[PDB]
Amino acid sequence: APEREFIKSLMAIGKRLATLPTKEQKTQRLISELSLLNHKLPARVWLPTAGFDHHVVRVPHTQAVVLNSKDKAPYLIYVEVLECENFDTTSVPARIPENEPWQEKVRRIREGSPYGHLPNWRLLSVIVKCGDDLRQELLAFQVLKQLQSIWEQERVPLWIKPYKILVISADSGMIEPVVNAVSIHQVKKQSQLSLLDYFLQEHGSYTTEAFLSAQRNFVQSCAGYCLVCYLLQVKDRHNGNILLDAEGHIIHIDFGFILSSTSAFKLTTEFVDVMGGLDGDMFNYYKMLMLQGLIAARKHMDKVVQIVEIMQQGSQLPCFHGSSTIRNLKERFHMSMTEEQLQLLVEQMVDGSM
Numbered sequence: 001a002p003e004r005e006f007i008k009s010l011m012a013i014g015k016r017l018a019t020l021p022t023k024e025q026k027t028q029r030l031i032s033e034l035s036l037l038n039h040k041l042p043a044r045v046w047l048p049t050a051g052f053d054h055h056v057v058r059v060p061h062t063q064a065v066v067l068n069s070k071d072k073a074p075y076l077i078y079v080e081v082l083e084c085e086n087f088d089t090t091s092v093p094a095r096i097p098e099n100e101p102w103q104e105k106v107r108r109i110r111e112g113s114p115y116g117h118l119p120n121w122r123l124l125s126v127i128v129k130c131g132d133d134l135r136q137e138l139l140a141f142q143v144l145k146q147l148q149s150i151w152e153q154e155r156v157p158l159w160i161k162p163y164k165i166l167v168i169s170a171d172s173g174m175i176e177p178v179v180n181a182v183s184i185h186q187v188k189k190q191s192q193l194s195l196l197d198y199f200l201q202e203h204g205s206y207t208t209e210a211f212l213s214a215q216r217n218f219v220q221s222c223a224g225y226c227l228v229c230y231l232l233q234v235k236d237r238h239n240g241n242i243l244l245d246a247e248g249h250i251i252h253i254d255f256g257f258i259l260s261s262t263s264a265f266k267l268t269t270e271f272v273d274v275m276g277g278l279d280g281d282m283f284n285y286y287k288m289l290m291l292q293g294l295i296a297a298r299k300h301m302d303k304v305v306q307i308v309e310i311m312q313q314g315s316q317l318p319c320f321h322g323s324s325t326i327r328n329l330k331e332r333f334h335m336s337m338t339e340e341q342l343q344l345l346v347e348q349m350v351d352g353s354m
């Protein structure tokens with residue numbers, strides 16, 4: 001499989017970075033390795049996350065990043081590709097010698113690239129995870145796609161961003177990154193502000209449309225991911241694993257600890273202050289969206305449970321501790337309860353989150 005030799009050498013770099021002790025040391029090896037890998041490009045190799053036929057021409061080593069984590073060495077790359085009509089039939093491009101928002105990232109790399117002038121030039125971006133098992137993430141991705149359209153169909157304006165997972169092996173794979181987004185940890189570290197103060201500074205003040213729309217996005221995304229976290233039993237929830245985007249949505253990531261596999265969905269005081277406090281209109285709206293999404297989820301529960309059963313049946317997954325996993329999942333929809341008892345459930349759920 002020469003067409004995968006790009007993939008195998010990428011996963012090798014990842015395993016090597018897991019040997020190095022510090023981010024600084026991982027960065028310098030990543031650069032060194034990618035620089036070496038450009039000597040083997042351009043080639044008849046793909047990056048499987050893309051939706052179109054292409055050949056990988058170049059990997060700019062200066063723009064690759066080692067990401068934070070406890071154990072492993074996850075790293076982000078920006079892969080340059082020339083698009084083609086067909087993968088197998090179109091000739092591999094000749095090698096042309098050498099000498100933040102997405103549009104700027106694209107512009108700056110394109111201007112610096114020897115391939116950037118060409119009409120078929122495209123830039124793709126992927127996070128490479130080696131060591132970790134992304135079947136957990138991939139199940140979550142599918143449940144997210146399903147829930148998104150359950151809320152689309154019943155007119156409920158909850159908001160979640162499913163991101164594409166690609167399982168290469170049992171202990172490796174690829175995640176497509178969220179582009180306009182940084183961790184809540186990083187926002188707080190860089191700004192030295194509360195989340196409310198960050199909103200007020202970055203978007204605008206309490207009565208501006210910029211704020212109110214960003215606050216609306218924040219509320220809708222929290223309520224969305226709160227239900228996701230309850231239904232899927234998502235653990236490992238911290239400001240490292242929650243992103244904030246340029247529009248003011250939150251994005252939960254890293255659904256590796258779900259179902260039968262402390263650390264639950266915490267609604268912090270600083271989160272509640274972004275919604276104008278407990279005795280407030282947008283917090284009442286947050287509680288409404290949780291109730292509205294849950295009734296929409298109850299009616300369409302077969303469409304989710306289908307997706308769960310299809311991904312466990314051909315695995316020996318750690319989250320699947322036998323048929324208790326679907327049994328407990330089903331019970332979390334609470335079909336026997338009334339809508340009045342579901343209000344009390346939502347209220348008890350929010351109290352538990354605080």
Ligand SMILES: COc1ccc(NC(=O)N2CCN(c3nc(N)nc4c3cnn4C)[C@@H](C)C2)c(C)c1
Binds near residue numbers: 182185239243
């Ligand atoms: C406690 O000290 C920590 C500090 C920060 C982080 N976290 C982190 O830096 N990021 C930024 C890069 N990351 C992603 N960025 C973007 N843009 N899209 C993504 C991901 C992950 N999935 N997706 C879709 C994730 C690694 C989250 C941590 C764990 C601990």
